[PDB]
Amino acid sequence: VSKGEELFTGVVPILVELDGDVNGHKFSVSGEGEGDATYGKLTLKFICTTGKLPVPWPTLVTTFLQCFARYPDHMKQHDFFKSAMPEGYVQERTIFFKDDGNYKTRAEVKFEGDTLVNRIELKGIDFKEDGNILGHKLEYNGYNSHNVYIMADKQKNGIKVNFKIRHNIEDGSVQLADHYQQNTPIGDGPVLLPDNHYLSYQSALSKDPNEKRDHMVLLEFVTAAGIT
């Protein structure tokens, strides 16, 4: 196994800490769980520690650990995420909500000992007061996409990722969220610059029946594909 790959052969504990500000509405979220890349499995629970989350949990699903994706053996050489570990990488995204505002996120993903940690800062601007986001008009469910596109970015020694999410609006319509992403390694060591490929997602949202705080239980299965 590769140096980076070896860090993911078993169950890895995860910690996520996010500070956000959407149209001046400030909030913080703490998350805990575990990743089992062998099965492309993520099991997580996020808690808003500042009170009520000012945006719908579904809009934060993509922000809330691609290093846990299951890369088929024949595609191992295209797994940028694990190759950058343990020093990690910085993930940046601009998420454009159609006919509404946008989120810009900066996440530092790396190991703190044997724990995979993600420190995230989220900034949202230009949102409409009674739009689907600030007006909480989105159904509490996930989105499953087979089109999370990955390609190399030799200029930052990393990758570029793009994909679309369609959140379900309570009236039966959909709220599009266009994602543009870039990942840059934190260390100066070699990383695997991948050939074009994609990740396939299965995402499910739920609630902890005994939890009184505003929270989200998230289960995902992530698999790389596209290179035969």
Numbering used by the authors: 1 to 64, 68 to 231
Direct quotes from the study:
The YFP mutants were named YFP-nG, where n is the number of the inserted amino acids (1, G; 3, GGG; 6, GGSGGT; 9, GGSGGTGGS; and 12, GGSGGTGGSGGT). Glycine, which has no side chain, caused a 1 nm spectral blue-shift in emission and decreased the fluorescence intensity. To confirm that the glycine insertion produced a space near the chromophore, we determined the crystal structures of YFP-1G and YFP-3G at 1.3 Å and 1.5 Å resolution, respectively. In the YFP-1G structure, β-strand 7 is slightly distorted, causing a small expansion of the barrel (cyan). The glycine insertion shifts β-strand 7 along the chain to the N-terminal direction for YFP-3G and the C-terminal direction for YFP-1G. The most remarkable difference is that the side chain of Tyr145 (Tyr146 for YFP-G1 and Tyr148 for YFP-G3) moved away from the neighborhood of the chromophore, producing a large space near the chromophore. The space is filled by water molecules in both YFP-1G and YFP-3G structures (arrow heads). While YFP did not show the pressure dependency in fluorescent intensity below 50 MPa (red), the single glycine insertion made YFP sensitive to the pressure (blue), and the further glycine insertion enhanced its pressure dependency (green). At the higher pressure, the intensity of YFP decreased with increased pressure, while that of YFP-3G increased and that of YFP-1G was biphasic.
